[PDB]
Coordinates of C-alpha atoms and ligand atoms in Angstrom, one line a residue:
Chain O
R347 CA 40.4 55.5 -60.8
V348 CA 38.0 56.5 -63.6
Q349 CA 34.4 56.9 -62.8
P350 CA 31.7 56.0 -65.3
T351 CA 29.3 58.7 -66.4
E352 CA 26.4 57.2 -68.4
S353 CA 24.2 54.2 -67.8
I354 CA 22.6 52.2 -70.6
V355 CA 20.3 49.2 -70.4
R356 CA 19.2 47.3 -73.5
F357 CA 16.5 44.6 -73.5
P358 CA 15.1 42.4 -76.2
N359 CA 12.6 43.5 -78.8
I360 CA 9.1 44.2 -77.7
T361 CA 6.5 42.3 -79.8
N362 CA 4.1 40.6 -77.4
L363 CA 1.3 43.1 -77.7
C364 CA -1.5 41.8 -75.6
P365 CA -4.9 41.4 -77.2
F366 CA -6.6 44.3 -75.3
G367 CA -8.2 46.1 -78.3
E368 CA -11.0 43.5 -78.6
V369 CA -11.8 43.7 -74.9
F370 CA -12.5 47.5 -75.2
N371 CA -13.4 47.4 -78.9
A372 CA -16.1 44.8 -78.4
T373 CA -19.2 44.6 -80.5
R374 CA -21.3 43.2 -77.7
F375 CA -21.0 43.0 -73.9
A376 CA -22.4 40.2 -71.8
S377 CA -25.4 40.8 -69.6
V378 CA -24.5 41.7 -66.0
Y379 CA -26.4 38.8 -64.4
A380 CA -24.2 36.4 -66.5
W381 CA -20.8 38.1 -66.9
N382 CA -18.1 36.8 -69.2
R383 CA -14.6 36.1 -67.9
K384 CA -11.5 36.2 -70.1
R385 CA -8.0 35.1 -69.0
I386 CA -4.7 36.2 -70.6
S387 CA -1.1 35.0 -70.4
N388 CA 2.2 35.4 -72.2
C389 CA 1.6 39.0 -73.3
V390 CA 2.9 42.4 -72.4
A391 CA 0.2 44.8 -71.2
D392 CA 0.4 48.4 -72.2
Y393 CA -1.2 49.8 -69.0
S394 CA 0.0 53.3 -69.9
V395 CA -2.1 53.8 -73.1
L396 CA -5.2 52.5 -71.3
Chain G
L545 CA -0.1 35.6 -58.7
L546 CA 1.0 32.0 -57.9
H547 CA 4.2 30.0 -57.6
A548 CA 4.1 29.1 -61.3
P549 CA 6.5 31.1 -63.6
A550 CA 5.1 34.5 -64.6
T551 CA 3.8 35.0 -68.1
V552 CA 2.7 38.6 -68.4
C553 CA 5.0 41.6 -67.7
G554 CA 5.1 45.3 -68.3
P555 CA 6.9 46.7 -71.4
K556 CA 10.5 47.2 -70.4
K557 CA 12.0 50.5 -71.7
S558 CA 15.1 49.9 -73.9
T559 CA 17.8 52.6 -73.7
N560 CA 20.4 53.5 -76.3
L561 CA 23.9 52.0 -77.0
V562 CA 27.3 53.7 -76.6
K563 CA 30.8 52.5 -77.1
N564 CA 34.4 53.5 -76.4
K565 CA 33.6 55.2 -73.1
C566 CA 33.7 53.5 -69.8
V567 CA 30.1 53.6 -68.6
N568 CA 27.7 51.5 -66.5
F569 CA 25.6 48.9 -68.2
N570 CA 22.9 46.3 -67.7
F571 CA 22.1 43.6 -70.4
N572 CA 19.1 41.3 -69.7
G573 CA 19.8 41.6 -66.0
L574 CA 23.6 41.1 -66.4
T575 CA 25.0 44.2 -64.7
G576 CA 28.5 45.6 -64.3
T577 CA 30.8 48.4 -65.5
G578 CA 33.4 48.6 -68.3
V579 CA 34.2 49.7 -71.8
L580 CA 32.0 48.5 -74.7
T581 CA 33.5 47.6 -78.1
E582 CA 33.2 45.2 -80.9
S583 CA 34.9 41.8 -81.1
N584 CA 35.6 39.1 -83.7
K585 CA 34.7 35.8 -82.1
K586 CA 31.2 34.6 -82.9
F587 CA 28.9 32.8 -80.5
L588 CA 26.6 30.0 -81.5
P589 CA 23.1 31.5 -82.2
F590 CA 21.8 30.3 -78.8
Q591 CA 24.4 31.7 -76.3
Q592 CA 24.8 34.9 -74.4
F593 CA 27.4 36.1 -71.8
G594 CA 30.9 34.7 -72.4
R595 CA 33.6 33.8 -69.9
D596 CA 37.4 33.2 -69.6
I597 CA 39.8 31.1 -67.6
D598 CA 39.0 33.2 -64.6
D599 CA 35.3 32.4 -65.2
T600 CA 34.4 36.2 -65.3
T601 CA 32.4 37.9 -67.9
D602 CA 34.3 38.8 -71.0
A603 CA 31.7 39.3 -73.9
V604 CA 28.0 39.9 -74.4
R605 CA 25.6 40.0 -77.3
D606 CA 23.4 43.1 -77.6
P607 CA 19.8 41.6 -77.6
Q608 CA 18.4 43.9 -80.3
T609 CA 21.0 44.0 -83.1
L610 CA 22.4 40.5 -82.4
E611 CA 26.0 41.5 -82.5
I612 CA 29.0 40.6 -80.4
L613 CA 30.4 43.1 -77.9
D614 CA 33.6 43.1 -75.8
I615 CA 34.1 44.3 -72.2
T616 CA 37.1 45.8 -70.3
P617 CA 37.5 47.4 -66.9
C618 CA 38.8 50.9 -66.6
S619 CA 39.9 51.1 -63.0
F620 CA 43.6 50.4 -63.1
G621 CA 46.4 52.7 -62.1
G622 CA 48.3 53.7 -59.0
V623 CA 49.6 57.3 -58.5
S624 CA 53.3 57.9 -57.9
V625 CA 55.4 61.1 -57.7
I626 CA 59.1 61.8 -58.3
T627 CA 60.9 64.3 -56.2
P628 CA 64.6 65.4 -56.5
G629 CA 64.6 66.2 -52.8
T630 CA 62.9 69.1 -51.1
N631 CA 66.3 70.1 -49.8
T632 CA 66.9 71.5 -53.3
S633 CA 63.9 73.0 -55.1
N634 CA 60.3 71.9 -55.2
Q635 CA 59.5 71.0 -58.8
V636 CA 58.1 67.4 -59.0
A637 CA 56.7 65.1 -61.7
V638 CA 53.8 62.7 -61.4
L639 CA 53.8 59.1 -62.7
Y640 CA 50.7 57.0 -63.3
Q641 CA 51.1 53.2 -63.3
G642 CA 49.3 51.6 -66.2
Chain E
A58 CA 17.5 -5.4 -74.5
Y59 CA 19.9 -4.0 -71.9
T60 CA 22.2 -2.3 -74.3
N61 CA 25.1 -0.2 -72.9
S62 CA 25.3 3.5 -73.2
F63 CA 28.3 4.6 -75.3
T64 CA 29.4 8.2 -74.7
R65 CA 26.1 10.0 -75.2
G66 CA 23.9 12.3 -73.3
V67 CA 25.9 15.5 -73.0
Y68 CA 24.3 18.9 -73.4
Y69 CA 25.3 22.6 -73.1
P70 CA 24.0 23.3 -69.6
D71 CA 24.5 27.1 -69.6
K72 CA 24.4 30.0 -72.0
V73 CA 28.1 30.8 -72.0
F74 CA 30.9 30.9 -74.6
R75 CA 33.8 29.3 -72.7
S76 CA 36.5 29.1 -75.3
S77 CA 39.5 26.7 -75.6
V78 CA 39.3 25.9 -71.8
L79 CA 38.2 22.9 -69.7
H80 CA 35.4 23.2 -67.2
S81 CA 33.7 21.1 -64.6
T82 CA 30.0 21.2 -63.7
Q83 CA 27.4 19.8 -61.2
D84 CA 24.3 18.9 -63.2
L85 CA 22.1 16.0 -64.3
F86 CA 23.9 13.8 -66.9
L87 CA 23.7 10.4 -68.5
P88 CA 26.3 8.2 -66.7
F89 CA 28.7 6.6 -69.1
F90 CA 28.3 2.9 -69.8
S91 CA 24.9 2.4 -68.3
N92 CA 22.4 -0.4 -69.1
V93 CA 19.6 1.2 -71.1
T94 CA 16.6 -0.8 -72.2
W95 CA 15.8 -1.5 -75.9
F96 CA 12.2 -1.3 -76.9
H97 CA 10.9 -2.2 -80.4
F108 CA 5.4 -2.8 -81.0
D109 CA 3.3 -2.2 -77.9
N110 CA 4.5 0.5 -75.5
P111 CA 3.4 0.5 -71.8
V112 CA 3.6 3.3 -69.3
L113 CA 7.2 4.1 -68.4
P114 CA 8.1 5.8 -65.1
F115 CA 9.3 9.3 -65.8
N116 CA 12.0 10.6 -63.6
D117 CA 14.2 13.8 -63.3
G118 CA 16.0 13.8 -66.6
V119 CA 15.5 11.3 -69.4
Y120 CA 17.3 10.3 -72.6
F121 CA 15.6 9.3 -75.9
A122 CA 16.9 8.4 -79.4
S123 CA 15.3 6.6 -82.3
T124 CA 15.7 5.9 -86.0
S127 CA 10.4 6.0 -90.7
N128 CA 8.8 9.1 -89.1
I129 CA 6.6 6.8 -87.0
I130 CA 7.3 8.9 -83.9
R131 CA 4.6 11.6 -83.5
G132 CA 4.9 13.0 -79.9
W133 CA 5.0 12.4 -76.2
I134 CA 2.6 12.5 -73.3
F135 CA 3.3 13.5 -69.7
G136 CA 1.3 13.3 -66.4
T137 CA 0.4 11.4 -63.3
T138 CA -3.3 10.5 -63.4
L139 CA -3.8 11.1 -67.2
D140 CA -7.6 11.2 -66.6
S141 CA -8.4 15.0 -66.9
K142 CA -8.0 15.5 -63.1
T143 CA -4.5 17.0 -62.7
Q144 CA -3.1 19.2 -65.5
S145 CA -1.0 17.2 -68.0
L146 CA 1.0 18.4 -71.0
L147 CA 0.6 17.0 -74.6
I148 CA 3.3 17.3 -77.3
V149 CA 2.7 15.7 -80.7
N150 CA 3.6 16.4 -84.3
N151 CA 0.4 17.4 -86.2
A152 CA 0.1 16.0 -89.7
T153 CA 0.8 19.5 -90.9
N154 CA 2.3 21.2 -87.8
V155 CA 3.5 20.5 -84.3
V156 CA 0.9 20.7 -81.4
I157 CA 2.0 22.1 -78.1
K158 CA -1.1 22.1 -75.8
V159 CA -1.5 21.9 -72.0
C160 CA -5.0 20.4 -71.5
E161 CA -5.7 17.6 -69.1
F162 CA -7.6 14.8 -71.0
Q163 CA -9.3 11.5 -70.5
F164 CA -6.6 9.4 -72.3
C165 CA -7.1 6.1 -74.1
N166 CA -5.3 2.9 -73.3
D167 CA -3.4 2.9 -76.7
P168 CA -3.9 6.4 -78.3
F169 CA -2.7 6.7 -81.9
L170 CA -3.8 7.9 -85.3
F185 CA -8.7 11.0 -83.7
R186 CA -8.1 8.0 -81.3
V187 CA -6.1 10.1 -78.8
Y188 CA -8.3 11.0 -75.8
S189 CA -11.9 10.7 -74.7
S190 CA -12.6 14.3 -73.7
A191 CA -11.1 17.7 -73.3
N192 CA -11.1 19.2 -69.8
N193 CA -10.3 22.7 -68.7
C194 CA -7.2 24.3 -70.3
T195 CA -4.3 26.4 -69.2
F196 CA -1.8 27.0 -72.0
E197 CA -1.6 26.3 -75.8
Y198 CA 1.0 26.8 -78.5
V199 CA 0.8 26.1 -82.2
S200 CA 4.2 25.7 -84.0
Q201 CA 4.9 26.6 -87.6
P202 CA 3.3 24.3 -90.2
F203 CA 5.5 21.2 -90.4
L204 CA 4.6 19.0 -93.4
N216 CA 18.0 8.7 -89.0
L217 CA 18.9 9.4 -85.4
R218 CA 17.0 12.1 -83.6
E219 CA 18.0 12.5 -80.0
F220 CA 15.9 14.0 -77.2
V221 CA 16.7 14.8 -73.6
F222 CA 14.1 16.3 -71.2
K223 CA 14.7 18.1 -67.9
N224 CA 11.9 19.5 -65.7
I225 CA 13.0 21.9 -62.9
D226 CA 11.1 24.7 -61.2
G227 CA 8.2 24.6 -63.5
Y228 CA 10.5 24.8 -66.6
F229 CA 10.5 22.1 -69.2
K230 CA 13.7 21.9 -71.2
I231 CA 14.0 20.1 -74.5
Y232 CA 17.3 19.2 -76.3
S233 CA 17.5 17.8 -79.8
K234 CA 20.4 17.1 -82.3
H235 CA 19.8 16.0 -85.8
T236 CA 22.3 13.5 -87.0
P237 CA 22.9 11.7 -90.3
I238 CA 23.8 8.0 -89.6
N239 CA 24.9 4.9 -91.5
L240 CA 24.8 2.2 -88.8
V241 CA 21.7 -0.1 -88.6
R242 CA 22.3 -0.9 -84.9
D243 CA 21.9 0.7 -81.5
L244 CA 23.8 3.8 -80.3
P245 CA 27.1 4.0 -82.3
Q246 CA 30.4 5.1 -80.8
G247 CA 30.3 8.5 -82.5
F248 CA 30.3 11.5 -80.1
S249 CA 28.0 14.5 -80.6
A250 CA 26.6 17.4 -78.6
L251 CA 23.1 18.3 -77.6
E252 CA 21.6 21.8 -78.2
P253 CA 18.7 23.4 -76.3
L254 CA 15.4 24.2 -78.2
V255 CA 12.6 25.6 -75.9
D256 CA 11.8 26.4 -72.3
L257 CA 8.3 25.7 -71.2
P258 CA 7.0 27.8 -68.3
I259 CA 4.1 25.4 -67.7
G260 CA 4.7 25.1 -63.9
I261 CA 3.3 21.6 -63.6
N262 CA 4.2 18.3 -62.0
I263 CA 5.1 15.2 -64.1
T264 CA 5.7 11.7 -62.9
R265 CA 4.9 9.4 -65.9
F266 CA 5.1 9.6 -69.6
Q267 CA 4.3 7.6 -72.8
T268 CA 5.4 7.6 -76.4
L269 CA 2.9 8.8 -79.1
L270 CA 2.7 6.9 -82.4
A271 CA 0.2 6.3 -85.2
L272 CA -0.9 3.4 -87.5
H273 CA -1.4 3.5 -91.2
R274 CA -4.6 2.0 -92.6
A291 CA 10.0 0.1 -84.6
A292 CA 13.3 1.1 -82.8
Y293 CA 13.8 3.6 -80.0
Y294 CA 15.7 3.7 -76.7
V295 CA 15.3 5.2 -73.2
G296 CA 17.9 6.4 -70.8
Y297 CA 17.7 7.8 -67.3
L298 CA 19.8 10.7 -65.9
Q299 CA 21.3 11.3 -62.4
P300 CA 23.5 13.9 -60.8
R301 CA 27.2 13.5 -61.6
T302 CA 30.5 15.5 -61.9
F303 CA 31.1 15.8 -65.7
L304 CA 34.2 17.5 -67.0
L305 CA 33.6 19.4 -70.3
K306 CA 36.0 20.5 -73.0
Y307 CA 35.2 23.5 -75.2
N308 CA 37.2 24.2 -78.3
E309 CA 37.8 27.7 -79.8
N310 CA 34.7 27.6 -81.9
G311 CA 32.6 26.7 -78.8
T312 CA 31.6 23.1 -79.6
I313 CA 32.0 20.3 -77.0
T314 CA 34.5 18.2 -78.8
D315 CA 35.0 15.8 -75.9
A316 CA 34.1 15.2 -72.3
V317 CA 35.3 13.1 -69.4
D318 CA 33.2 11.5 -66.6
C319 CA 34.4 11.3 -63.1
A320 CA 33.9 8.6 -60.5
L321 CA 33.9 6.0 -63.3
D322 CA 37.5 4.7 -63.0
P323 CA 40.6 5.7 -61.0
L324 CA 42.2 7.2 -64.1
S325 CA 39.0 9.2 -64.7
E326 CA 39.2 10.7 -61.2
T327 CA 42.8 11.5 -61.8
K328 CA 41.8 13.4 -64.9
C329 CA 39.0 15.0 -62.9
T330 CA 41.3 16.5 -60.2
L331 CA 44.0 18.0 -62.3
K332 CA 41.6 19.6 -64.8
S333 CA 43.4 18.0 -67.8
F334 CA 42.8 15.4 -70.4
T335 CA 46.4 14.1 -70.1
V336 CA 48.4 13.1 -67.1
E337 CA 52.2 12.8 -66.8
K338 CA 54.0 9.8 -65.2
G339 CA 54.0 9.7 -61.4
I340 CA 51.8 9.2 -58.3
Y341 CA 48.8 11.4 -57.5
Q342 CA 46.3 11.8 -54.7
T343 CA 42.6 11.8 -55.6
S344 CA 40.4 11.3 -52.6
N345 CA 40.3 9.8 -49.1
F346 CA 38.9 6.4 -47.9
Ligands
LIG1 C1 14.2 44.9 -83.1 O1 13.6 46.1 -83.7 C2 14.6 46.9 -84.4 C3 13.9 48.2 -84.8 O2 14.7 49.0 -85.5 C4 15.0 46.1 -85.6 O3 16.0 46.8 -86.4 C5 15.9 46.6 -87.8 O4 17.2 46.3 -88.3 C6 17.2 46.0 -89.7 C7 18.6 45.7 -90.1 O5 19.0 46.3 -91.3 C8 16.6 47.2 -90.5 O6 16.6 46.9 -91.9 C9 15.2 47.6 -90.0 O7 14.8 48.8 -90.7 C10 15.2 47.8 -88.5 N1 13.9 48.1 -88.0 C11 12.9 47.2 -88.1 C12 11.6 47.7 -87.5 O8 13.0 46.1 -88.6 C13 15.6 44.8 -85.2 O9 15.9 43.9 -86.3 C14 14.6 44.0 -84.3 N2 15.2 42.8 -83.8 C15 15.2 41.7 -84.5 C16 15.8 40.5 -83.8 O10 14.7 41.6 -85.6
LIG2 C1 70.1 70.9 -47.4 O1 70.2 70.7 -46.0 C2 71.4 71.2 -45.4 C3 71.4 70.8 -44.0 O2 72.2 71.8 -43.2 C4 71.6 72.7 -45.7 O3 72.8 73.2 -45.2 C5 71.4 73.0 -47.1 O4 71.4 74.4 -47.4 C6 70.2 72.4 -47.7 N1 70.1 72.6 -49.2 C7 69.8 73.8 -49.7 C8 69.8 73.8 -51.2 O5 69.5 74.7 -49.1
LIG3 C1 -3.5 20.4 -87.0 O1 -3.3 21.3 -88.1 C2 -4.6 21.7 -88.7 C3 -4.2 22.7 -89.8 O2 -3.0 23.3 -89.6 C4 -5.4 22.4 -87.6 O3 -6.7 22.8 -88.2 C5 -5.7 21.5 -86.4 O4 -6.4 22.1 -85.4 C6 -4.3 21.0 -85.9 N1 -4.5 20.0 -84.8 C7 -4.8 20.3 -83.6 C8 -5.0 19.2 -82.6 O5 -4.8 21.5 -83.2
LIG4 C1 -11.3 22.1 -64.6 O1 -12.4 21.7 -65.5 C2 -13.7 21.6 -64.9 C3 -14.6 21.1 -66.0 O2 -15.7 20.4 -65.4 C4 -14.1 22.9 -64.3 O3 -15.3 22.7 -63.5 C5 -13.0 23.4 -63.3 O4 -13.3 24.7 -62.8 C6 -11.6 23.5 -64.0 N1 -10.6 23.8 -63.1 C7 -9.9 25.0 -63.1 C8 -8.9 25.2 -62.1 O5 -10.2 25.8 -64.0
LIG5 C1 36.4 26.9 -86.1 O1 35.9 28.2 -86.6 C2 36.5 28.6 -87.8 C3 35.9 29.9 -88.1 O2 34.5 29.9 -88.2 C4 36.1 27.5 -88.9 O3 36.6 27.9 -90.1 C5 36.5 26.2 -88.5 O4 36.1 25.2 -89.4 C6 36.0 25.8 -87.1 N1 36.5 24.5 -86.6 C7 35.8 23.7 -85.9 C8 36.5 22.4 -85.5 O5 34.7 23.9 -85.5

């Protein structure tokens, strides 16, 4: 028998960059007594860079 | 987190691609082992995987370059030995199967 | 009119490349030779079920609606061809009795998902399946010459988009518009459809089982041709 040596995994292209810049590069923040809520979906979150 | 289908996921890390060397693989969740090489038959531009009469995986499209690849196992072969009889001499020869 | 289905309603159920072999599957299909209803100007609410056929032949068709209450209470999906694009929105609305073309809905409630397609300025066939929060849409463009209902030509159905909405749908209605009609509906059911794939990968022909004894005979032997002689299909 021949045993395999390497192990490769390929996945589709990554292009769903989540809109997280505007959240942290925001011109204004809402007042604490009336906080603003934002929901996101269908995006890939780069938790690492944050 | 609910029972609805998920929408947000972490960035999956994509590895490299190698051929002509029997190695483990995993494409889009499809796992297995074999030898990777090009083919000639062309899928329709909405299909992945690829089967045979024995309904086992036979081809796959690499989901970054959009090209056809072929698969082949590498675990054949039984070991056999030829002996002229230990009564006379000890030199032997080895025969593999396939 | 209760016209009869003529060898239509077959779609690639899986992402495979089975080549030059026959294959049998267990999935929702349109039973061969079924009485489907002809509709020509007013359209009432039609009861949506698991699986549905649709074909028409103009550009009067604009979209579809789906939901149960249709009164901005439970989430409902809207699909419609924008005058310049295609609108894919998931926002429960207060719908009108006869929406058309902004005489569509009274008000916009909370929203979950939206999608805007690219700007989009004979017989078009549509089949919709909804399973496990996934909406599947199949279309097949076809140049035609007949001026009647479903002709005897045979064609395949290709998948377009999966919708991970995760919602529940029970009813639907067609979306049209008026400037200041011919379409059909078919209902699916679970069956045992044999499928034939050529070398290229196209479904050149298929055979239904449980239709006629000869059909079951073809079903058991996994062949489109049977030699002379007795056989044994099932038990009574
Ligand atoms: C996924 O990203 C890769 C990144 O390299 C794309 O590869 C491109 O391939 C074309 C083919 O000649 C080259 O001209 C480009 O220079 C490559 N890079 C880029 C960034 O385009 C690949 O095309 C992408 N996948 C798809 C489906 O487009
Ligand atoms: C083979 O076995 C026989 C058994 O007696 C023995 O006499 C003979 O010597 C053996 N062969 C050799 C080459 O020694
Ligand atoms: C239709 O398209 C126009 C221009 O592309 C856009 O402004 C409008 O919002 C679209 N309709 C809907 C309901 O989104
Ligand atoms: C649905 O919309 C109404 C608008 O009055 C809102 O009060 C409610 O919170 C929304 N539901 C969800 C689940 O967001
Ligand atoms: C089969 O594929 C070949 C190669 O692409 C093509 O030339 C031929 O027209 C195809 N035939 C059918 C029936 O699809």
